[PDB]
Amino acid sequence: QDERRALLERCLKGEGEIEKLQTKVLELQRKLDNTTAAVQELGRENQSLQIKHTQALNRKWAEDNEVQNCMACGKGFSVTVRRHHCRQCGNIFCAECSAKNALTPSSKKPVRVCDACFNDLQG
Amino acid sequence: QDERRALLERCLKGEGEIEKLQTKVLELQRKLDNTTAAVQELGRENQSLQIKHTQALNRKWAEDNEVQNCMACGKGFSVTVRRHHCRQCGNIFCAECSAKNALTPSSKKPVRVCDACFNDLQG
Numbered sequence: 001q002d003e004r005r006a007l008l009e010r011c012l013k014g015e016g017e018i019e020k021l022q023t024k025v026l027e028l029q030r031k032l033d034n035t036t037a038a039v040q041e042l043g044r045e046n047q048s049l050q051i052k053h054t055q056a057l058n059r060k061w062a063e064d065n066e067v068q069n070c071m072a073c074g075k076g077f078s079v080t081v082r083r084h085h086c087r088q089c090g091n092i093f094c095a096e097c098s099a100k101n102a103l104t105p106s107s108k109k110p111v112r113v114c115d116a117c118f119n120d121l122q123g
Numbered sequence: 124q125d126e127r128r129a130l131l132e133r134c135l136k137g138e139g140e141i142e143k144l145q146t147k148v149l150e151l152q153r154k155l156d157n158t159t160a161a162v163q164e165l166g167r168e169n170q171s172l173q174i175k176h177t178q179a180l181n182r183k184w185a186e187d188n189e190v191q192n193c194m195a196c197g198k199g200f201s202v203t204v205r206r207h208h209c210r211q212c213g214n215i216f217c218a219e220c221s222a223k224n225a226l227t228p229s230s231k232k233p234v235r236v237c238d239a240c241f242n243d244l245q246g
């Protein structure tokens with residue numbers, strides 16, 4: 001009589017704690033999936049950055065004969081299509097791929113830079 | 124009686140399943156806490172690289188008026204203690220803290236750089 005009246009309580013209360021726990025689990029799962037996806041994107045991004053920073057440090061003024069085409073548009077050099085350098089990356093380009101001058105740490109007066117390095121300086 | 128027997132079981136099984144679920148809840152929390160900690164850590168890392176990167180992509184030839192001391196030894200500039208620039212970072216140094224020349228992407232010939240940037244460009 002009162003025996004089953006209390007067992008139902010224990011049971012009903014249990015089948016209820018379960019439903020709650022299960023919900024908490026689907027919850028933490030999604031949040032885990034969410035944060036896991038982000039920490040992985042950070043791992044890739046950190047390797048991407050360290051690598052680019054490294055490549056930016058090796059930068060050196062290129063030797064003319066080593067570059068036969070504009071490092072930006074691929075145009076070939078000749079007597080009519082002369083060489084120019086970017087004071088930022090040290091690469092060689094035609095005049096149309098280095099028509100802009102910018103303020104760099106190498107000179108007080110703006111110097112020649114390629115389009116890529118120009119936009120990097122944020123201006 | 125068979126009714127009382129069944130109920131007890133229903134309940135025991137319920138208790139069994141709850142235990143499993145509670146451990147799982149704590150497992151997912153442990154993992155979510157570790158990942159959430161790893162996220163903030165790697166995030167600060169990439170930010171620091173962004174900072175160092177943006178900090179370089181904003182360096183210009185420092186104005187002499189805005190630098191009253193060698194960016195390296197604090198040595199103050201005078202009529203005799205002249206100002207000099209490092210072509211890699213654009214900062215100002217005394218002749219003693221910028222007595223070295225190195226190869227940069229800004230010129231074909233070695234240019235004046237501070238001790239830092241020299242050894243920075245691996246000597």
Ligand SMILES: O=P(O)(O)O[C@@H]1[C@H](O)[C@H](OP(=O)(O)O)[C@@H](O)[C@H](O)[C@H]1O
Nearest residue numbers: 062063064082083084085086092112
């Ligand atoms: O006059 P030229 O014979 O074209 O010589 C070129 C110029 O001196 C370019 O200077 P610039 O970058 O200031 O144009 C330089 O970057 C090239 O390496 C040289 O081949």
Ligand SMILES: O=P(O)(O)O[C@@H]1[C@H](O)[C@H](OP(=O)(O)O)[C@@H](O)[C@H](O)[C@H]1O
Nearest residue numbers: 185186187205206207208209215235
């Ligand atoms: O000649 P001075 O009167 O000292 O003028 C300084 C020199 O021209 C320095 O050239 P340098 O770095 O190539 O020596 C330059 O870095 C400073 O900005 C100038 O104020």
Ligand SMILES: [Zn+2]
Nearest residue numbers: 070073094097
């Ligand atoms: Zn070109």
Ligand SMILES: [Zn+2]
Nearest residue numbers: 086089114117
């Ligand atoms: Zn460039």
Ligand SMILES: [Zn+2]
Nearest residue numbers: 209212237240
């Ligand atoms: Zn320097």
Ligand SMILES: [Zn+2]
Nearest residue numbers: 193196217220
């Ligand atoms: Zn000094």
